[PDB]
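Both lines are retained for reference:
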Amino acid sequence: SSLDNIEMAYARQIYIYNEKIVNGHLQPNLVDLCASVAELDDKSISDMWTMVKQMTDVLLTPATDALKNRSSVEVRMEFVRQALAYLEQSYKNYTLVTVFGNLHQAQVPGTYQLVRSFLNIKLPLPGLQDGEVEGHPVWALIYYCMRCGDLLAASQVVNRAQHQLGEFKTWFQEYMNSKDRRLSPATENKLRLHYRRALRNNTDPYKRAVYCIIGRCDVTDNQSEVADKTEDYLWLKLNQVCFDDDGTSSPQDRLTLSQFQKQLLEDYGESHFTVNQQPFLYFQVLFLTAQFEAAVAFLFRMERLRCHAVHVALVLFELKLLLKSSGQSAQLLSHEPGDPPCLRRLNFVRLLMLYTRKFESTDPREALQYFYFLRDEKDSQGENMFLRCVSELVIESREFDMILGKLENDGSRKPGVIDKFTSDTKPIINKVASVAENKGLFEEAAKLYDLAKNADKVLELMNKLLSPVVPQISAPQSNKERLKNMALSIAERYRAQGISANKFVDSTFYLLLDLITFFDEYHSGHIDRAFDIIERLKLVPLNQESVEERVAAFRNFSDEIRHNLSEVLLATMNILFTQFKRLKDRDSQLRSQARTLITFAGMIPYRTSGDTNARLVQMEVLMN
């Protein structure tokens, strides 16, 4: 098996997810099934799924293309709110463990008191301004209340520092009471002027940071003294991004979400974030900024972490969030000319195929579960992608019994892996059989048509396969022996089970087998038994009385039968010629039969009739 513990754990979740789809039961959320796998791995994987769950928990318009939803301002703003919520709750957890040692012992206080207990450890310094509030510097209290996502707690601190904060009291009030955490253009410019004029080059880093979080200003300043870690930097910038240009505000000192997204993907990039040691940190950077496709593409190239990237993509696919490439030939990560900037396309088919191809040779059962995600996908020619992957896997692996089921001698069918995806498995088996047929795998196709109980196609292909080998020697491990044996198996099973194709195809098949028996007795030297066979077949005439009706019947015999007339005539003539020598009136009728064959041969057009008729007459001459 090529699947490791986590990869296999994921596969089981896909098995469960698919089982519910097929049986029309209440379908549990895939993200939840996948998140439970993090228990078997580090906290990075648990944190990844926690983030993914929150970033994809947004309100989407139903029955709508992912591009329309992903491009709407409502959805884009909700991604930011979900990212800010995650980053704020994450920091509040870091504060709970800092004060209580671990999240277990926190068993809860309000944000204001929690921050106070936190500053005892965080700030057990000179530059701070505007005094304290109940023992701790006011701006540190405000910043960390905001960093924990509790604006009400921050306002309580402001309400207790009205004295020295000045006009910031009313600015924070408007900010908190605004629905989108945004000041009015007039108050924002006022604050911005106040920041540039006075509070720039200030000694209280918390004051500067709080000011331009509220004012969404100094966007090139990362406030590193207080927002020293990557998540603090994401939280800061996401609080400052402006989505669309309203046409009235000044663009100076403004950070749009598009720029910020392109700064992290293009300008900074993998290298900046110490990528190999902390690939999940860059994945978080991309995913928290709603660059889902680029995030998946990035993590997918980390082959040790590829399963995580694939199953995040499956969640995005199932939630109708994923932006998919139009074609299967595009790169893994691409973009279309009319898509908004920073929105990218993921080649979903390619990503899934590259993943299954790692293990479909050793674990075909699992690969089939992942193929089912392509049941609604179509290839460049319009074929169902799930059936195409199934057909190719079946044909290339030759695991016909396991995947498609096993036909038993009594006509029953043992279920296969395919039975887990439907109850009407016959059309799928037939489809795979046709694919094998178009590829020239006629023996394989016939077996598959037999599994599908498609008698017309089985005997059609067997006629095509038997016809060339009818006169050949049934040598061990030869093509004729193999084809003859599977023809005898079919004949026996079909006779016992009462199965029959259309009369024309059906009679051709059993006549081809009867001729195979004729030649085998002939090649084995059983001249008399061979003669008894061909006579009972009433195929060629042995007396002038039967010549006319044999010529008539030959006009409706299949090309497969007509192709073998030459060898039937030669072998039959040699039988009469052999029986003639062994006598040395038995002669009159023996040479009369030979002359009947020549007469019959002359009235019938058949392959190689010139050289054959010559050889027949040459044997007759050695009898008269």
Summary: The beta strands are 132-133, 136-137, 241-242, 255-256, 333-334, 345-346, 406-407, 413-414. The chain has 32 helices and eight strands. The first helix runs from residue 5 to 22.
